[PDB]
């Protein structure tokens, strides 16, 4: 945290087992916070959060996922991951999905993301109790059977 013109500036550093080097790319993304407590997500620009491109409902039909139950799909650490393509903003950075059921045929899924600090940030994320309210995109997938 540094000041150059009486206005606070953010300058993040890439730590390499004790040695730090300037990493500009990531510094600009974090700087884009719009006055919020956390950097805003961009669905068209490579942010700190990375880029998430949700897979079409077509895939459901393609892989014959219809047969799988809502519950069934829910109870899958790895299958849930198969509904989107992710491009992490930095090495070791990961993104996953948490699924929420809103109907017997449609369920809402929220994206969980890995951050520089090693913490997972999502809709329910709250540091020091204040709602970050980042505003990650939300998608719904429907077409599940009943058995």
């Amino acid at each position: 945290i540094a000041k150059d013109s009486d206005q606070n500036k953010i300058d993040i550093y890439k730590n390499n087992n004790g040695l730090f080097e300037i990493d500009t790319q990531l510094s600009n993304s974090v700087a884009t916070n719009n006055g919020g407590l956390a950097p805003s997500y961009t669905e068209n620009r490579v942010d700190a959060w990375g880029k998430v491109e949700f897979a079409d409902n077509s895939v459901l039909q393609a892989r014959n996922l219809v047969d799988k139950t809502v519950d069934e799909i829910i109870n899958t650490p790895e299958i849930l991951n198969s509904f989107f393509r992710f491009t992490p903003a930095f090495e070791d950075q990961k993104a996953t999905l948490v699924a929420t059921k809103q109907s017997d045929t449609s369920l809402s899924v929220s994206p969980r993301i890995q951050f520089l600090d090693g913490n997972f940030y999502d809709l329910n994320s709250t540091i020091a109790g204040v709602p970050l309210n980042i505003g990650f995109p939300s998608r719904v997938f429907a077409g599940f059977a009943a058995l």
Binding site: N16, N17, L19, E21, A62, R63, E78, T87
Partner: protein, 1284 residues
């Protein structure tokens, strides 16, 4: 595309690479191959008088593109070839196509996606030969390969009037005289410029003191900036009352009147950068052994010389100059030596104009004007350090990959090394990859800015080696590099290294150049030798005295305190009362400095310690650096900081903190350390080394005791002389040499009981050539050794120049009553660091050059008619107090003993030959005598270093000429272990060859757990011509030197060594010594030792393989020779060695084992299961013959593929479930079903297709392997429900 059998596997001399062991997902070998054809007439390419090297080199490359072919074929894990990769001839090559995330598009059975077009620069890359290969540590199927012009191999076969030596033999029609190439006449006082001499201090400050002295007062040195633009107001360092001799015109270094046919590089650093066909190149590429698209290219990068030269420190723009400047420049130029720190007179290999700039003029600074205040300002420069063609390919080879980057640590130099020219690896290159290997960047840096963080705590071996530096990188480390590898978790570098110059640190008295020809020739670039040569009597009292003080006593009749002859017997006692009179009065300022009335002198270790670049506890701690070594003179290995090497920037930025002083007033208050200007990054690079090693984990005299224990490779006898009163004595150590002396009467008699030895009785062996009154007075010597200037009587003790008046007027003499017993070059003195001649640099130099077997010997007499020297009735080993013991004491190699070295070589007596060769040295007392050095008869040199091989998680070693050396304990040290093990070569037909390293064909770790090496007695080469029509008295060869005459007065018949032996004019001596001058050519040494022809007998051919001695946890344990409790550590180590001279193998010392093979040896190819010599000896995979995939007609598809393929394997690891292995693989009866399984490599659920590879437990290794014979398409297969 498919394999061609006409290309045969080979080892390149510069890196000794032959193959890479591939590991991980698909193991095997890559290995170098070349066309087998002879009759390669390169001399058919005409060189005219009217053209330059570049269009000649393009004609040679174009010609060699017709005459030869080269490739890097792949082999399987059983040694069987897969595809050819002749890069000049492969059809329709392509770069690899990428996804939007930068990943290469891939599917194992299809292979990589190809863009359908070649890489960049393809028209100039395709002629280059591939010479090294490495694998990515983190990314699968990704590799890097290094390519070079064909002349980077064939340079040794190009014609000799363009590929010149740095020296010339000539016709020798006037008879040979090695002084004819040497500027030799001494400087003199200027008859019109005496008045500017440094002033005597007319009044001296009291400082509230009381003592007083009659001796002449201190000399002032005043320096201040003044008000004028380009003049100081005073500059007393610039004073110059001496001038050169006018012997047929003025004598000074002047290249255009001396180098009438000057040596220059093949191409300049700018030419190699712009001419894209002549630079080295690294490419990334992808490989998959069983795909349709099996190989395709990534990215291409040129190893651009400007990316090295624009990363050199600012001082390397002015290598003619140094941070002391004007006074040092004048003292050097008066003594006819080199100026700066890395000038082309010594080191032309890094300069675009070679010997044509080998002079002291135009140093990048204003010098030589008529006013002393006008010299010492910055100006333009025209001779910077560069990277020309010869040095460039020595800076190429030894690759390693770390993270998203790949490095090049440089070779041993056998791309471009000649007999008199020493190209070496001066740094490291890096290629770094970006945007997920979609883009790249290339860079490099010199070792000087990397190694500058070295300190005495970072080694378990000797301390104080000449590896130190400061804020100016004037210490220039370079290596012949053995390699870089992972030793378990630690990254390691190895090879041989250049120290700073240890030899030319002592400096002559101004008039005496005419009688010390070897020390000036070693300072002139004429004697390209780094061994320390003993010359004490002609040295000045101090190297660093400003030249305006040198004229203060021309008669010597006052023994002028500020400038006089170096001898230690005649200097001050400055006691409790004395310092306040003679020296502590001369306080000084920000514009005043002084030269003090103290008398000062010492032997070789005093001179070396005072002005060599030794390591200390602190880094950046060497404000004096005399010069840099001609060739590698140290062993080296180190632990390299791999994450810091990954994190350092591509561009290095310097600033005013690394510039030399712009004017001499800013030079007067010159800060040895300063803050980097915080935009700069040069100081980050110093921390790339964690630890280093240089030889055994031994200290003090113990290291000289180890030097005597190893066998000399010329005959297999130890240097110790103890395995057989008139018996001979050892050359390196002092134990049992001379007599046991009680040191209880040493010092000024000041304090010598329990001081120096772990025992009640202070006995020390006094060494060869010692001084005593009588055998009854063997303890100390009283002061009686006074020296006149003429016949001018004693040094006059109790005179007013040898007295002071203390507080209360109680005057006393300022001189020694008693002195040490020895001054000889063999001297070891625990109690006298200024009379000892052994030193830690020399201990490591002797270690290396006694391993290479090429320490020289000093001669008066050859084996010729009436010239002879004898074993019997002419040498007396028991009487080393007199001339009958034949100790030279002048011109001798430092630390050792010449008569013992001559005996261990067998130059006299039947030790090395069936009859006495009668060559040697005799100390006559009837007349003046003449001497010169000659080689040992062997031809190995310190650049002869082979592959770094890693034996296990902590042990590694390498080939070094006639030795294999192992650094067994460096990563995890222990007490009582010496840390090094050694195996000698045995074959005399290799050892006595004239260029012997050309017979080594590479070294490797073998499957029985031993490192091994290849040898070929048919691969040796003769000299460039048969001497055509005349006897070449000088014959340039890899163990030749221009050793000069040393001439001396008669030795005294008794009390022989009580004073140093007095030198005389040697400038005319060469006509008196012709039998010795013929023995400067090492072929005549071989002829007189009986080794020069087929007279060696034994094997007619007999090439094959060599192997190091067997080893266990006990090997190299010497815990009974370490520590003390009854004597001194070297003496108990000598006792521990003398019961073991017949049983050296438990010490880790001995001969290698060897086995013969028929035909040629050309190189190994290596893979994790096996090593194949010449690629022959491949196998049917005999452990796995019964293992195979089921064919498509034996599978009932709906039994497998009714279920989707999504659940036939574990998604967390992609192995197929155990029960389905025998459903897809045929196996023998009673087989262990847990020993094998299938890995999925690609699939698609919408096609129900599953692609697999099999993995099995190797019977030999604790790791899994593929089963290569498992199908007609190898270890990979596909299964699908009738829909292929």
């Amino acid at each position: 595309q498919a394999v061609d059998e006409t290309l045969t596997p080979w080892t390149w001399n510069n890196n000794n690479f032959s193959s890479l062991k591939i590991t991980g997902e698909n193991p095997g070998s890559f290995g170098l191959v070349r066309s087998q054809n002879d009759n390669l007439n390169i001399s058919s390419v005409t060189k005219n008088s009217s053209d330059d090297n570049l269009k000649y080199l393009n004609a040679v490359e174009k010609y060699l593109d017709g005459q030869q072919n080269f490739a890097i074929r792949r082999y399987d894990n059983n040694g069987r070839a897969l595809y050819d990769i002749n890069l000049a001839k492969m059809e329709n090559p392509s770069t690899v196509q990428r996804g939007l995330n930068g990943e290469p598009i891939f599917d194992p059975f299809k292979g990589f996606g190809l863009t359908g077009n070649a890489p960049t620069d393809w028209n100039e890359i395709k002629g280059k030969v591939p010479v090294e290969v490495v694998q990515s540590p983190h990314s699968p199927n990704l590799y890097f390969v290094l390519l070079v012009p064909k002349v980077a191999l064939e340079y040794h076969n190009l014609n000799n009037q363009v590929v010149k030596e740095s020296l010339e033999v000539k016709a020798t029609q006037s008879s040979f005289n090695p002084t004819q190439r040497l500027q030799k006449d001494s400087p003199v006082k200027d008859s019109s410029k005496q008045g500017e001499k440094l002033s005597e201090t007319t009044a001296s400050s009291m400082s509230s003191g009381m003592a007083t002295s009659t001796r002449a007062k201190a000399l002032k040195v005043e320096v201040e900036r003044g008000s004028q633009s380009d003049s100081l107001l005073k500059n007393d360092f610039a004073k110059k009352p001496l001038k050169h001799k006018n012997s047929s015109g003025e004598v000074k270094l002047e290249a255009e009147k001396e180098f009438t046919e000057a040596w220059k590089p093949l191409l300049t650093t700018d030419q190699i950068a712009r001419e894209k066909g002549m630079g080295a190149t690294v490419v990334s590429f992808y490989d998959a052994p069983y795909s349709e698209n099996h190989t395709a290219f990534g990215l291409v990068d040129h190893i651009d010389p400007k990316k090295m030269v624009e990363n050199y420190p600012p001082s390397w723009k002015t290598p003619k100059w140094n941070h002391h400047g004007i006074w040092d420049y004048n003292a050097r130029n008066l003594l006819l030596q080199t100026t700066g720190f890395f000038n082309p007179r010594r080191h032309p290999e890094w300069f675009d104009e070679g010997q044509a700039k080998a002079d002291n003029t135009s140093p990048g600074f204003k010098v030589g004007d008529t006013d002393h205040k006008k010299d010492g300002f910055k100006k333009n420069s025209s001779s910077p350090i560069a990277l020309p063609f010869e040095a460039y390919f020595a800076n190429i080879g030894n690759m390693v990959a770390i993270g998203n980057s790949v490095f090049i640590f440089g070779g041993n130099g056998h791309a471009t090394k000649m007999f008199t020219t020493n190209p070496l690896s001066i740094g490291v290159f890096r290629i770094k990859y970006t945007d997920n290997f979609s883009k790249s960047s290339v860079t490099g840096w010199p070792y000087a800015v990397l190694f500058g963080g070295l300190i005495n705590p970072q080694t378990n071996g000797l301390k104080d080696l000449p590896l130190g530096t400061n804020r100016w990188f004037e210490y220039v480390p370079r290596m012949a590099v053995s390699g870089v590898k992972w030793v378990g978790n630690q990254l390691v570098l190895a090879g041989t290294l250049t120290m700073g110059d240890t030899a030319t640190v002592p400096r002559l008295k101004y008039d005496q150049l005419e009688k010390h020809l070897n020390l000036v020739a070693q300072g002139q670039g004429l004697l390209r030798e780094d061994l320390q040569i003993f010359t004490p009597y002609g040295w000045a009292n101090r190297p660093d005295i400003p030249v305006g003080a040198w004229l203060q006593d021309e008669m010597g009749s006052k023994f002028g305190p500020h400038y006089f002859l170096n001898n230690p017997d005649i200097q001050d006692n400055v006691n409790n009362d004395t310092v306040e009179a003679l020296i502590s009065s001369y306080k000084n300022t920000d514009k005043l400095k002084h030269v003090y009335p103290y008398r000062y002198s010492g032997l070789y270790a005093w001179q070396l310690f005072n002005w060599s670049n030794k390591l200390t506890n602190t880094p950046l701690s060497a404000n004096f650096v005399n010069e840099n070594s001609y060739a590698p003179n140290s062993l080296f290995a180190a632990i390299l900081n791999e994450d810091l090497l990954t994190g350092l920037s591509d561009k290095i930025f310097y600033g005013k903190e690394n510039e030399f002083a712009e004017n001499e007033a800013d030079r007067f208050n010159q800060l040895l350390s300063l803050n980097p200007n915080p935009n700069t990054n040069w100081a980050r690079y110093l921390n790339v080394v964690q630890r280093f090693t240089t030889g055994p984990n031994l200290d003090s005299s113990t290291f000289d005791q180890f030097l005597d224990f190893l066998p000399w490779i010329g005959n297999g006898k130890p240097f110790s002389n103890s395995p057989s009163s008139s018996t001979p004595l050892p050359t390196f150590s002092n134990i049992n040499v001379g007599v046991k002396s009680m040191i209880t009467q040493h010092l000024n008699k000041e304090n010598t009981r329990w001081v120096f030895i772990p025992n009640f009785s202070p006995d020390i062996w006094t060494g060869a050539g010692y001084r005593v009154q009588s055998a009854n007075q063997k303890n100390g010597i009283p002061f009686e050794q006074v020296k006149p200037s003429n016949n001018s009587t004693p040094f006059d003790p109790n005179s007013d120049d040898n007295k002071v008046t203390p507080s209360g007027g109680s005057s006393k003499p300022t001189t020694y009553p008693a002195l040490p017993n020895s001054i000889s070059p063999t001297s070891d003195w625990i109690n006298a660091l200024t009379f000892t001649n052994k030193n830690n640099p020399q201990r490591n130099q002797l270690l290396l050059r006694s391993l290479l077997g090429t320490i020289p010997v000093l001669i008066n007499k050859s084996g010729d008619s009436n010239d002879q020297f004898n074993k019997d009735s002419e040498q007396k080993w028991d009487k080393t107090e007199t001339n009958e013991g034949n100790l030279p004491g002048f011109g001798e190699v430092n630390g050792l003993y010449n008569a013992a070295l001559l005996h261990t070589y067998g130059f006299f007596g039947t030790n090395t030959n069936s009859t006495d060769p009668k060559i040697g040295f005799k100390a006559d007392s009837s007349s003046s005598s003449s001497s010169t050095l000659v080689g040992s008869g062997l031809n190995w040199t310190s650049q002869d270093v082979g592959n770094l091989v890693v034996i296990n998680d902590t042990s590694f070693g390498f080939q070094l000429g006639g030795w294999f050396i192992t650094f067994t304990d460096f990563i995890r040290p222990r007490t009582g272990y010496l840390g090094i093990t050694l195996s000698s070569l045995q074959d005399q037909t290799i050892i006595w060859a004239d260029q012997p390293w050309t017979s080594f064909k590479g070294s490797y770790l073998d499957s029985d757990g031993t490192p091994k090496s290849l040898w070929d007695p048919t691969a040796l080469k003769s000299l460039p011509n048969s001497s055509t029509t005349y006897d070449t008295n000088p014959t340039l060869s890899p163990s030749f030197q221009l050793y000069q005459p040393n001439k001396v007065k008669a030795y005294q018949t008794t009390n022989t060594y009580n004073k140093l032996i007095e030198p005389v004019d040697a400038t005319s001596a060469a006509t008196n010594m012709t039998s010795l001058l013929k023995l400067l050519t090492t072929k005549n040494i071989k002829a007189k030792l009986g080794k020069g022809t087929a007279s060696s007998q034994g094997n007619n051919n007999g090439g094959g393989v060599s192997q190091t001695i067997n080893t266990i946890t006990t090997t190299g344990n010497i815990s009974e020779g370490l520590k003390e409790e009854t004597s001194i550590q070297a003496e108990t180590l000598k006792k521990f060695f003398d019961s073991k001279q017949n049983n050296k193998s438990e010490i880790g010392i001995g001969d290698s084992t060897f086995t013969k093979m028929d035909g040629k040896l050309t190189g190994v190819v290596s893979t994790p299961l096996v090593n194949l010599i010449n690629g022959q000896g491949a196998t049917s995979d005999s452990d796995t013959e019964k293992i195979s995939f089921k064919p498509g007609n034996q599978i009932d598809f709906n039994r497998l593929f009714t279920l989707p393929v999504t659940e036939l394997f574990d998604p967390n690891t992609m192995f197929v479930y155990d029960q389905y292995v025998p459903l897809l693989v045929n196996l023998p009866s009673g087989f262990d079903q847990a020993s094998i399984r299938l890995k999925v490599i690609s699939y698609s659920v919408e096609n129900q297709t599953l692609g697999v590879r099999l993995e099995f437990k190797d019977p030999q290794t604790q790791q899994f392997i593929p089963v290569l014979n498992a199908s007609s398409t190898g270890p990979q297969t596909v299964f699908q429900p009738f829909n292929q």
